[PDB]
C-alpha cells in the first residue's frame, strides 16, 4: 500500500493551509505528492529536493486528465489522502472518483481534508436559514451516494452537499470560522451532524514550525525580505485592502476600480468620511486576482507602498508584520484579522453583512456601502 497525497485548490485559504501541511512534512523527501494549486507556484529549487512530486492543472474547478497519467505511474495498491476546497469539493474530486472507478481493484480513498474557499461557504450557508437543515442533510447524503455510485452529479442543495462527506469517507474540515457554526441557531442540526469532524484553521501553526521550515513556507507563499523590510519601518502603518469582481464587462470592472480608489481616499484624505489621521504610512494590499483593478490604485494614488497582491494577507500575521490598522472592502482576510486592527469594513438584508454581524466582526451600526460615499475631488 502506497499513499498518494493530493493538494488541490483554485483559491487561497485552502492552498495556504495545504502548503502549511506540506511544510510540516517536508522532512519526508519522497512521499508521492500531487499539487493542484492555481494561485501558488512552488519554486524549482524547492522542487528539485523532492521526489515523486507532481503538478496538475485545474480547469472548471477540476484536475485535468493529466492527473490520470500521474496516477498511472503507481502500479501498486494506492490510497488517496485528498486535500480539497470545500466550496468546490464536489467538482474537485470528480476526476479522482472517475479514475477510481477505472481501478476499484487498486485505488481507494484514504481520507479527505477540506478547507474553506473563503467567505463563500458562509454567505451561501446564510441563504439556507429558512430551510429544514436536518432534511437537507439526509437529502444530500442520498445524492452523494448517487454520485459515488454513478459518477453523476445532481444535488438539490449544493451548499449542504458540501458538508456530507463523512457519510462516505473519513474526513476533517477546517473552518475559517467555527464561531459561525456555533452561533447560527438555524445551523444546529449541521453542527451536531458534523459532530467531531471539524476544527478551526490554526493560524498559529507557523509559529510552531522550526525557523528553517518557516523560511521554507515563506518561500512557498512568495514572502521575500524586500517586502519584509517595507514592513519594518517603525512608523504606524495602515493597509488598504483591495477587492475585485469576476465579471468580464469592462464597465463593471472600471466602476469597481473607481469605487475602490475613491474609498481609498475616504480613508487617507482629511475630508474623507473614513479619515484615520495623517501620521500613518499607507500600503496597498490588492486582491490576488485584482489585475487591472490593482493597477488602477497604484496608477492614481500618491504615497503608498504596494504589498505584492500575490501575497496572502494572513502572512503578515504569521510573520508578525501586521500593521496598526486595516481598512477596505469586505473579504476573507478580515475573518482572521485581530479585532483591534479593524479600521472599517466597506461593502460593495445582505447575507455577507449578516455573516459579519453574526460573527461580531462588525457592530449593530449602519453598514457602509460602496456607493454611499461621495466622489472626492
Ligand atoms: C462570497 C464569495 O464568493 N467570496 C469569495 C471567497 O470564497 C473566495 F473566493 C475569495 O476570497 P477573498 O475573500 O477575497 O479573500 C481570500 C483570501 O485571499 C487573499 N487576499 C484577498 C484580498 C486581498 N485584498 N488580499 C489578500 O491577500 C487572502 O488570503 C484572503 O484571506 C477569493 O477570491 O479567494 O473571493 C471571495 C469573492 O467575494 C470575491 O472576493 C469578491 O467578488
Ligand atoms: O479563483 C478561485 C476562485 O474562483 C471563483 O470563481 C470565478 C473564477 O475564478 C473566474 O476565473 C471566473 O471568470 O468567474 C468565477 C465566478 O463566476 C470562485 O467563485 C471562488 O470561490 C474561488 O474558487
GROMACS .gro file of C-alpha atoms and ligand atoms in nm:
model
  442
    1UNK     CA    1   0.000   0.000   0.000
    2UNK     CA    2   0.133   0.337  -0.115
    3UNK     CA    3  -0.024   0.665  -0.003
    4UNK     CA    4  -0.054   0.947  -0.256
    5UNK     CA    5  -0.134   1.289  -0.120
    6UNK     CA    6  -0.323   1.543  -0.324
    7UNK     CA    7  -0.326   1.918  -0.264
    8UNK     CA    8  -0.594   2.085  -0.473
    9UNK     CA    9  -0.727   2.440  -0.465
   10UNK     CA   10  -0.822   2.713  -0.709
   11UNK     CA   11  -0.846   2.979  -0.437
   12UNK     CA   12  -0.629   3.099  -0.149
   13UNK     CA   13  -0.716   2.986   0.202
   14UNK     CA   14  -0.716   2.614   0.124
   15UNK     CA   15  -0.380   2.644  -0.054
   16UNK     CA   16  -0.231   2.836   0.241
   17UNK     CA   17  -0.339   2.551   0.467
   18UNK     CA   18  -0.236   2.267   0.236
   19UNK     CA   19   0.111   2.413   0.187
   20UNK     CA   20   0.141   2.454   0.564
   21UNK     CA   21   0.057   2.084   0.588
   22UNK     CA   22   0.316   2.007   0.325
   23UNK     CA   23   0.574   2.213   0.508
   24UNK     CA   24   0.509   2.022   0.831
   25UNK     CA   25   0.609   1.710   0.640
   26UNK     CA   26   0.893   1.845   0.428
   27UNK     CA   27   1.131   1.609   0.608
   28UNK     CA   28   0.986   1.322   0.403
   29UNK     CA   29   1.155   1.390   0.068
   30UNK     CA   30   0.995   1.101  -0.123
   31UNK     CA   31   0.624   1.085  -0.033
   32UNK     CA   32   0.413   1.089  -0.353
   33UNK     CA   33   0.257   1.439  -0.368
   34UNK     CA   34   0.034   1.596  -0.635
   35UNK     CA   35  -0.005   1.974  -0.618
   36UNK     CA   36  -0.302   2.127  -0.793
   37UNK     CA   37  -0.263   2.484  -0.669
   38UNK     CA   38  -0.383   2.757  -0.907
   39UNK     CA   39  -0.262   3.061  -0.711
   40UNK     CA   40   0.071   2.916  -0.595
   41UNK     CA   41   0.382   2.816  -0.782
   42UNK     CA   42   0.634   2.603  -0.598
   43UNK     CA   43   0.986   2.734  -0.666
   44UNK     CA   44   1.204   2.497  -0.869
   45UNK     CA   45   1.478   2.499  -0.606
   46UNK     CA   46   1.228   2.353  -0.359
   47UNK     CA   47   1.101   2.115  -0.628
   48UNK     CA   48   1.435   1.953  -0.710
   49UNK     CA   49   1.482   1.848  -0.345
   50UNK     CA   50   1.173   1.631  -0.371
   51UNK     CA   51   1.089   1.305  -0.542
   52UNK     CA   52   0.754   1.177  -0.667
   53UNK     CA   53   0.626   1.536  -0.666
   54UNK     CA   54   0.378   1.614  -0.941
   55UNK     CA   55   0.180   1.910  -1.063
   56UNK     CA   56  -0.166   1.915  -1.216
   57UNK     CA   57  -0.356   2.199  -1.379
   58UNK     CA   58  -0.706   2.298  -1.267
   59UNK     CA   59  -0.990   2.373  -1.508
   60UNK     CA   60  -1.354   2.441  -1.434
   61UNK     CA   61  -1.275   2.356  -1.071
   62UNK     CA   62  -1.129   2.020  -1.157
   63UNK     CA   63  -0.793   1.849  -1.218
   64UNK     CA   64  -0.744   1.786  -1.590
   65UNK     CA   65  -0.687   1.430  -1.711
   66UNK     CA   66  -0.316   1.499  -1.676
   67UNK     CA   67  -0.395   1.364  -1.329
   68UNK     CA   68  -0.451   1.021  -1.475
   69UNK     CA   69  -0.110   0.987  -1.634
   70UNK     CA   70   0.030   1.071  -1.288
   71UNK     CA   71  -0.162   0.800  -1.108
   72UNK     CA   72  -0.077   0.551  -1.383
   73UNK     CA   73   0.283   0.575  -1.268
   74UNK     CA   74   0.200   0.400  -0.938
   75UNK     CA   75   0.102   0.032  -1.006
   76UNK     CA   76   0.066  -0.093  -0.651
   77UNK     CA   77  -0.238  -0.068  -0.426
   78UNK     CA   78  -0.269   0.302  -0.354
   79UNK     CA   79  -0.465   0.507  -0.102
   80UNK     CA   80  -0.554   0.873  -0.151
   81UNK     CA   81  -0.520   1.146   0.109
   82UNK     CA   82  -0.711   1.429  -0.059
   83UNK     CA   83  -0.699   1.794   0.046
   84UNK     CA   84  -0.985   1.992  -0.108
   85UNK     CA   85  -1.152   2.333  -0.123
   86UNK     CA   86  -1.494   2.296   0.044
   87UNK     CA   87  -1.693   2.518  -0.193
   88UNK     CA   88  -1.576   2.321  -0.496
   89UNK     CA   89  -1.520   1.988  -0.329
   90UNK     CA   90  -1.774   1.807  -0.546
   91UNK     CA   91  -1.610   1.908  -0.873
   92UNK     CA   92  -1.252   1.884  -0.742
   93UNK     CA   93  -1.298   1.518  -0.655
   94UNK     CA   94  -1.481   1.426  -0.974
   95UNK     CA   95  -1.184   1.303  -1.176
   96UNK     CA   96  -1.041   1.135  -0.865
   97UNK     CA   97  -1.350   0.922  -0.836
   98UNK     CA   98  -1.368   0.881  -1.215
   99UNK     CA   99  -1.021   0.735  -1.214
  100UNK     CA  100  -1.109   0.538  -0.905
  101UNK     CA  101  -1.392   0.362  -1.082
  102UNK     CA  102  -1.145   0.274  -1.359
  103UNK     CA  103  -0.948   0.100  -1.086
  104UNK     CA  104  -1.167  -0.018  -0.795
  105UNK     CA  105  -0.931  -0.314  -0.760
  106UNK     CA  106  -0.633  -0.090  -0.680
  107UNK     CA  107  -0.726   0.272  -0.596
  108UNK     CA  108  -0.910   0.373  -0.280
  109UNK     CA  109  -0.975   0.695  -0.090
  110UNK     CA  110  -0.796   0.710   0.244
  111UNK     CA  111  -0.946   1.033   0.375
  112UNK     CA  112  -1.036   1.391   0.289
  113UNK     CA  113  -0.922   1.721   0.436
  114UNK     CA  114  -1.142   2.011   0.337
  115UNK     CA  115  -1.075   2.381   0.375
  116UNK     CA  116  -1.295   2.688   0.336
  117UNK     CA  117  -1.270   2.859   0.000
  118UNK     CA  118  -1.321   3.179   0.193
  119UNK     CA  119  -1.633   3.380   0.268
  120UNK     CA  120  -1.849   3.196   0.013
  121UNK     CA  121  -1.935   2.893   0.226
  122UNK     CA  122  -2.067   3.133   0.489
  123UNK     CA  123  -2.259   3.361   0.252
  124UNK     CA  124  -2.402   3.051   0.085
  125UNK     CA  125  -2.484   2.892   0.423
  126UNK     CA  126  -2.658   3.214   0.530
  127UNK     CA  127  -2.902   3.162   0.237
  128UNK     CA  128  -3.021   2.832   0.387
  129UNK     CA  129  -3.166   2.994   0.701
  130UNK     CA  130  -3.535   2.917   0.641
  131UNK     CA  131  -3.479   2.560   0.527
  132UNK     CA  132  -3.518   2.233   0.714
  133UNK     CA  133  -3.148   2.174   0.771
  134UNK     CA  134  -3.197   1.820   0.901
  135UNK     CA  135  -3.396   1.722   0.593
  136UNK     CA  136  -3.148   1.900   0.365
  137UNK     CA  137  -2.872   1.678   0.506
  138UNK     CA  138  -3.033   1.337   0.453
  139UNK     CA  139  -3.128   1.454   0.103
  140UNK     CA  140  -2.767   1.542   0.034
  141UNK     CA  141  -2.632   1.215   0.174
  142UNK     CA  142  -2.851   1.015  -0.060
  143UNK     CA  143  -2.744   1.225  -0.360
  144UNK     CA  144  -2.379   1.183  -0.275
  145UNK     CA  145  -2.443   0.812  -0.263
  146UNK     CA  146  -2.588   0.853  -0.611
  147UNK     CA  147  -2.281   1.047  -0.721
  148UNK     CA  148  -2.040   0.795  -0.575
  149UNK     CA  149  -2.228   0.507  -0.742
  150UNK     CA  150  -2.284   0.657  -1.089
  151UNK     CA  151  -2.023   0.927  -1.127
  152UNK     CA  152  -2.320   1.156  -1.183
  153UNK     CA  153  -2.364   1.489  -1.006
  154UNK     CA  154  -2.711   1.609  -0.913
  155UNK     CA  155  -2.766   1.796  -0.587
  156UNK     CA  156  -3.089   1.958  -0.475
  157UNK     CA  157  -2.892   2.164  -0.225
  158UNK     CA  158  -2.533   2.233  -0.348
  159UNK     CA  159  -2.448   2.424  -0.030
  160UNK     CA  160  -2.539   2.142   0.208
  161UNK     CA  161  -2.388   1.885  -0.028
  162UNK     CA  162  -2.055   2.033   0.077
  163UNK     CA  163  -2.087   1.908   0.435
  164UNK     CA  164  -2.196   1.544   0.396
  165UNK     CA  165  -1.864   1.384   0.301
  166UNK     CA  166  -1.846   1.196   0.633
  167UNK     CA  167  -2.127   0.975   0.507
  168UNK     CA  168  -1.874   0.828   0.263
  169UNK     CA  169  -1.516   0.886   0.377
  170UNK     CA  170  -1.321   0.970   0.695
  171UNK     CA  171  -1.293   1.347   0.681
  172UNK     CA  172  -1.195   1.657   0.873
  173UNK     CA  173  -1.300   2.010   0.785
  174UNK     CA  174  -1.101   2.321   0.867
  175UNK     CA  175  -1.326   2.621   0.915
  176UNK     CA  176  -1.237   2.987   0.865
  177UNK     CA  177  -1.497   3.039   1.135
  178UNK     CA  178  -1.606   2.777   1.384
  179UNK     CA  179  -1.793   3.056   1.563
  180UNK     CA  180  -2.039   3.075   1.271
  181UNK     CA  181  -2.138   2.710   1.310
  182UNK     CA  182  -2.187   2.761   1.684
  183UNK     CA  183  -2.366   3.096   1.675
  184UNK     CA  184  -2.611   3.050   1.389
  185UNK     CA  185  -2.904   2.890   1.572
  186UNK     CA  186  -3.057   2.770   1.246
  187UNK     CA  187  -2.749   2.558   1.184
  188UNK     CA  188  -2.757   2.340   1.495
  189UNK     CA  189  -2.854   2.028   1.300
  190UNK     CA  190  -2.549   2.069   1.074
  191UNK     CA  191  -2.335   2.150   1.377
  192UNK     CA  192  -2.439   1.836   1.560
  193UNK     CA  193  -2.428   1.633   1.241
  194UNK     CA  194  -2.068   1.735   1.178
  195UNK     CA  195  -2.004   1.635   1.540
  196UNK     CA  196  -1.628   1.591   1.580
  197UNK     CA  197  -1.525   1.600   1.214
  198UNK     CA  198  -1.419   1.965   1.214
  199UNK     CA  199  -1.186   2.228   1.358
  200UNK     CA  200  -1.081   2.591   1.320
  201UNK     CA  201  -0.798   2.684   1.082
  202UNK     CA  202  -0.491   2.705   1.305
  203UNK     CA  203  -0.331   3.042   1.224
  204UNK     CA  204  -0.065   3.000   1.494
  205UNK     CA  205   0.068   2.685   1.319
  206UNK     CA  206   0.351   2.883   1.156
  207UNK     CA  207   0.481   2.980   1.498
  208UNK     CA  208   0.525   2.610   1.568
  209UNK     CA  209   0.742   2.532   1.265
  210UNK     CA  210   1.118   2.535   1.317
  211UNK     CA  211   1.272   2.859   1.180
  212UNK     CA  212   1.403   2.669   0.878
  213UNK     CA  213   1.059   2.541   0.788
  214UNK     CA  214   0.925   2.893   0.847
  215UNK     CA  215   1.164   3.028   0.586
  216UNK     CA  216   1.063   2.737   0.364
  217UNK     CA  217   0.691   2.813   0.398
  218UNK     CA  218   0.754   3.183   0.337
  219UNK     CA  219   0.920   3.070   0.018
  220UNK     CA  220   0.604   2.892  -0.092
  221UNK     CA  221   0.374   3.186  -0.018
  222UNK     CA  222   0.612   3.418  -0.201
  223UNK     CA  223   0.712   3.628   0.101
  224UNK     CA  224   1.054   3.794   0.049
  225UNK     CA  225   1.274   4.010   0.272
  226UNK     CA  226   1.226   4.312   0.049
  227UNK     CA  227   0.857   4.311   0.139
  228UNK     CA  228   0.951   4.202   0.491
  229UNK     CA  229   1.153   4.525   0.507
  230UNK     CA  230   0.888   4.764   0.369
  231UNK     CA  231   0.705   4.648   0.680
  232UNK     CA  232   0.999   4.702   0.918
  233UNK     CA  233   0.967   5.081   0.944
  234UNK     CA  234   0.874   5.181   1.300
  235UNK     CA  235   0.612   5.428   1.175
  236UNK     CA  236   0.245   5.348   1.234
  237UNK     CA  237   0.112   5.169   0.923
  238UNK     CA  238  -0.227   5.134   0.750
  239UNK     CA  239  -0.308   4.868   0.494
  240UNK     CA  240  -0.579   4.945   0.247
  241UNK     CA  241  -0.714   4.608   0.129
  242UNK     CA  242  -0.847   4.563  -0.221
  243UNK     CA  243  -1.122   4.353  -0.374
  244UNK     CA  244  -1.225   4.254  -0.727
  245UNK     CA  245  -1.508   4.129  -0.947
  246UNK     CA  246  -1.549   3.813  -1.152
  247UNK     CA  247  -1.742   3.992  -1.424
  248UNK     CA  248  -1.577   4.041  -1.757
  249UNK     CA  249  -1.774   4.352  -1.853
  250UNK     CA  250  -1.522   4.636  -1.881
  251UNK     CA  251  -1.794   4.860  -1.742
  252UNK     CA  252  -1.838   4.684  -1.410
  253UNK     CA  253  -1.462   4.639  -1.375
  254UNK     CA  254  -1.375   5.006  -1.429
  255UNK     CA  255  -1.651   5.104  -1.187
  256UNK     CA  256  -1.505   4.874  -0.922
  257UNK     CA  257  -1.158   5.020  -0.950
  258UNK     CA  258  -1.309   5.368  -0.945
  259UNK     CA  259  -1.517   5.299  -0.639
  260UNK     CA  260  -1.218   5.143  -0.465
  261UNK     CA  261  -0.985   5.429  -0.545
  262UNK     CA  262  -1.241   5.670  -0.408
  263UNK     CA  263  -1.284   5.454  -0.097
  264UNK     CA  264  -0.908   5.465  -0.054
  265UNK     CA  265  -0.930   5.841  -0.038
  266UNK     CA  266  -1.209   5.849   0.222
  267UNK     CA  267  -0.953   5.681   0.446
  268UNK     CA  268  -0.644   5.889   0.359
  269UNK     CA  269  -0.796   6.229   0.275
  270UNK     CA  270  -0.857   6.472   0.562
  271UNK     CA  271  -1.212   6.544   0.442
  272UNK     CA  272  -1.281   6.178   0.383
  273UNK     CA  273  -1.567   6.012   0.570
  274UNK     CA  274  -1.323   5.747   0.693
  275UNK     CA  275  -1.019   5.967   0.758
  276UNK     CA  276  -0.783   5.795   1.003
  277UNK     CA  277  -0.547   6.086   1.067
  278UNK     CA  278  -0.221   6.186   0.897
  279UNK     CA  279   0.070   6.007   1.058
  280UNK     CA  280   0.014   5.661   0.909
  281UNK     CA  281   0.232   5.508   0.638
  282UNK     CA  282  -0.009   5.381   0.372
  283UNK     CA  283   0.028   5.047   0.191
  284UNK     CA  284  -0.181   4.864  -0.070
  285UNK     CA  285  -0.276   4.501  -0.045
  286UNK     CA  286  -0.465   4.434  -0.365
  287UNK     CA  287  -0.673   4.121  -0.422
  288UNK     CA  288  -0.470   3.836  -0.582
  289UNK     CA  289  -0.691   3.844  -0.889
  290UNK     CA  290  -0.700   4.222  -0.881
  291UNK     CA  291  -0.533   4.260  -1.219
  292UNK     CA  292  -0.623   4.592  -1.383
  293UNK     CA  293  -0.811   4.670  -1.064
  294UNK     CA  294  -0.497   4.673  -0.850
  295UNK     CA  295  -0.302   4.866  -1.112
  296UNK     CA  296  -0.559   5.143  -1.103
  297UNK     CA  297  -0.493   5.224  -0.737
  298UNK     CA  298  -0.115   5.228  -0.788
  299UNK     CA  299  -0.152   5.443  -1.101
  300UNK     CA  300  -0.370   5.706  -0.932
  301UNK     CA  301  -0.274   5.703  -0.564
  302UNK     CA  302   0.011   5.909  -0.417
  303UNK     CA  303   0.242   5.800  -0.133
  304UNK     CA  304   0.151   5.434  -0.097
  305UNK     CA  305   0.371   5.128  -0.059
  306UNK     CA  306   0.241   4.831  -0.256
  307UNK     CA  307   0.234   4.483  -0.099
  308UNK     CA  308   0.251   4.235  -0.392
  309UNK     CA  309  -0.106   4.111  -0.444
  310UNK     CA  310   0.007   3.750  -0.479
  311UNK     CA  311   0.097   3.754  -0.108
  312UNK     CA  312  -0.197   3.649   0.107
  313UNK     CA  313  -0.274   3.894   0.385
  314UNK     CA  314  -0.271   3.625   0.654
  315UNK     CA  315   0.105   3.600   0.601
  316UNK     CA  316   0.164   3.935   0.777
  317UNK     CA  317   0.002   3.784   1.083
  318UNK     CA  318   0.221   3.474   1.078
  319UNK     CA  319   0.542   3.672   1.046
  320UNK     CA  320   0.419   3.926   1.299
  321UNK     CA  321   0.428   4.210   1.047
  322UNK     CA  322   0.067   4.311   1.099
  323UNK     CA  323   0.007   4.691   1.081
  324UNK     CA  324  -0.175   4.910   1.334
  325UNK     CA  325  -0.479   4.944   1.108
  326UNK     CA  326  -0.652   4.772   0.815
  327UNK     CA  327  -0.937   4.906   0.605
  328UNK     CA  328  -1.118   4.843   0.279
  329UNK     CA  329  -1.370   4.619   0.104
  330UNK     CA  330  -1.501   4.315   0.289
  331UNK     CA  331  -1.309   3.997   0.209
  332UNK     CA  332  -1.189   3.679   0.376
  333UNK     CA  333  -0.882   3.821   0.549
  334UNK     CA  334  -1.099   4.009   0.794
  335UNK     CA  335  -1.240   3.681   0.927
  336UNK     CA  336  -0.898   3.606   1.079
  337UNK     CA  337  -0.773   3.960   1.138
  338UNK     CA  338  -0.710   4.064   1.503
  339UNK     CA  339  -1.015   4.262   1.617
  340UNK     CA  340  -0.831   4.574   1.731
  341UNK     CA  341  -0.676   4.622   1.386
  342UNK     CA  342  -1.008   4.690   1.216
  343UNK     CA  343  -1.033   5.045   1.083
  344UNK     CA  344  -1.355   4.995   0.880
  345UNK     CA  345  -1.522   4.738   0.652
  346UNK     CA  346  -1.693   4.867   0.341
  347UNK     CA  347  -1.932   4.659   0.134
  348UNK     CA  348  -1.995   4.672  -0.240
  349UNK     CA  349  -3.075   4.233   0.433
  350UNK     CA  350  -2.736   4.142   0.276
  351UNK     CA  351  -2.604   3.790   0.356
  352UNK     CA  352  -2.237   3.887   0.360
  353UNK     CA  353  -2.337   4.157   0.608
  354UNK     CA  354  -2.535   3.916   0.822
  355UNK     CA  355  -2.235   3.686   0.847
  356UNK     CA  356  -2.007   3.969   0.952
  357UNK     CA  357  -2.265   4.062   1.214
  358UNK     CA  358  -2.337   3.713   1.350
  359UNK     CA  359  -1.961   3.684   1.386
  360UNK     CA  360  -1.936   4.022   1.558
  361UNK     CA  361  -1.678   4.129   1.301
  362UNK     CA  362  -1.892   4.441   1.269
  363UNK     CA  363  -2.131   4.602   1.516
  364UNK     CA  364  -2.502   4.687   1.511
  365UNK     CA  365  -2.426   5.025   1.349
  366UNK     CA  366  -2.522   5.130   0.996
  367UNK     CA  367  -2.314   4.933   0.747
  368UNK     CA  368  -2.134   5.147   0.489
  369UNK     CA  369  -2.176   5.084   0.120
  370UNK     CA  370  -1.952   5.137  -0.182
  371UNK     CA  371  -2.181   5.399  -0.334
  372UNK     CA  372  -2.294   5.599  -0.030
  373UNK     CA  373  -1.954   5.770  -0.041
  374UNK     CA  374  -1.935   6.093  -0.240
  375UNK     CA  375  -1.675   6.119  -0.515
  376UNK     CA  376  -1.379   6.308  -0.366
  377UNK     CA  377  -1.225   6.574  -0.586
  378LIG     C1  378  -1.876   3.533  -0.124
  378LIG     C2  379  -1.761   3.490  -0.203
  378LIG     O1  380  -1.785   3.447  -0.307
  378LIG     N1  381  -1.641   3.505  -0.154
  378LIG     C3  382  -1.515   3.471  -0.208
  378LIG     C4  383  -1.433   3.369  -0.133
  378LIG     O2  384  -1.494   3.248  -0.101
  378LIG     C5  385  -1.304   3.349  -0.215
  378LIG     F1  386  -1.333   3.303  -0.340
  378LIG     C6  387  -1.228   3.479  -0.235
  378LIG     O3  388  -1.165   3.530  -0.119
  378LIG     P1  389  -1.138   3.673  -0.063
  378LIG     O4  390  -1.237   3.690   0.033
  378LIG     O5  391  -1.130   3.783  -0.145
  378LIG     O6  392  -1.007   3.662   0.012
  378LIG     C7  393  -0.950   3.537   0.029
  378LIG     C8  394  -0.804   3.541   0.059
  378LIG     O7  395  -0.733   3.592  -0.048
  378LIG     C9  396  -0.632   3.677  -0.007
  378LIG     N2  397  -0.650   3.823  -0.016
  378LIG    C10  398  -0.767   3.878  -0.066
  378LIG    C11  399  -0.780   4.011  -0.091
  378LIG    C12  400  -0.671   4.095  -0.067
  378LIG     N3  401  -0.709   4.208  -0.081
  378LIG     N4  402  -0.555   4.044  -0.019
  378LIG    C13  403  -0.542   3.911   0.006
  378LIG     O8  404  -0.446   3.881   0.038
  378LIG    C14  405  -0.622   3.649   0.140
  378LIG     O9  406  -0.552   3.531   0.156
  378LIG    C15  407  -0.765   3.627   0.175
  378LIG    O10  408  -0.787   3.582   0.305
  378LIG    C16  409  -1.116   3.456  -0.328
  378LIG    O11  410  -1.117   3.524  -0.433
  378LIG    O12  411  -1.027   3.378  -0.300
  378LIG    O13  412  -1.315   3.565  -0.302
  378LIG    C17  413  -1.441   3.595  -0.248
  378LIG    C18  414  -1.519   3.672  -0.355
  378LIG    O14  415  -1.603   3.751  -0.278
  378LIG    C19  416  -1.452   3.787  -0.424
  378LIG    O15  417  -1.363   3.833  -0.327
  378LIG    C20  418  -1.548   3.906  -0.436
  378LIG    O16  419  -1.628   3.905  -0.553
  379LIG     O1  420  -1.003   3.161  -0.826
  379LIG     C1  421  -1.074   3.093  -0.728
  379LIG     C2  422  -1.197   3.147  -0.712
  379LIG     O2  423  -1.273   3.141  -0.837
  379LIG     C3  424  -1.407   3.196  -0.826
  379LIG     O3  425  -1.475   3.183  -0.949
  379LIG     C4  426  -1.453   3.273  -1.058
  379LIG     C5  427  -1.327   3.230  -1.143
  379LIG     O4  428  -1.210   3.228  -1.067
  379LIG     C6  429  -1.308   3.331  -1.262
  379LIG     O5  430  -1.193   3.296  -1.341
  379LIG     C7  431  -1.442   3.328  -1.346
  379LIG     O6  432  -1.434   3.416  -1.453
  379LIG     O7  433  -1.562   3.361  -1.264
  379LIG     C8  434  -1.579   3.270  -1.147
  379LIG     C9  435  -1.705   3.310  -1.068
  379LIG     O8  436  -1.816   3.329  -1.152
  379LIG    C10  437  -1.489   3.120  -0.722
  379LIG     O9  438  -1.622   3.172  -0.712
  379LIG    C11  439  -1.417   3.129  -0.584
  379LIG    O10  440  -1.491   3.063  -0.482
  379LIG    C12  441  -1.273   3.070  -0.599
  379LIG    O11  442  -1.270   2.927  -0.626
   0.00000   0.00000   0.00000
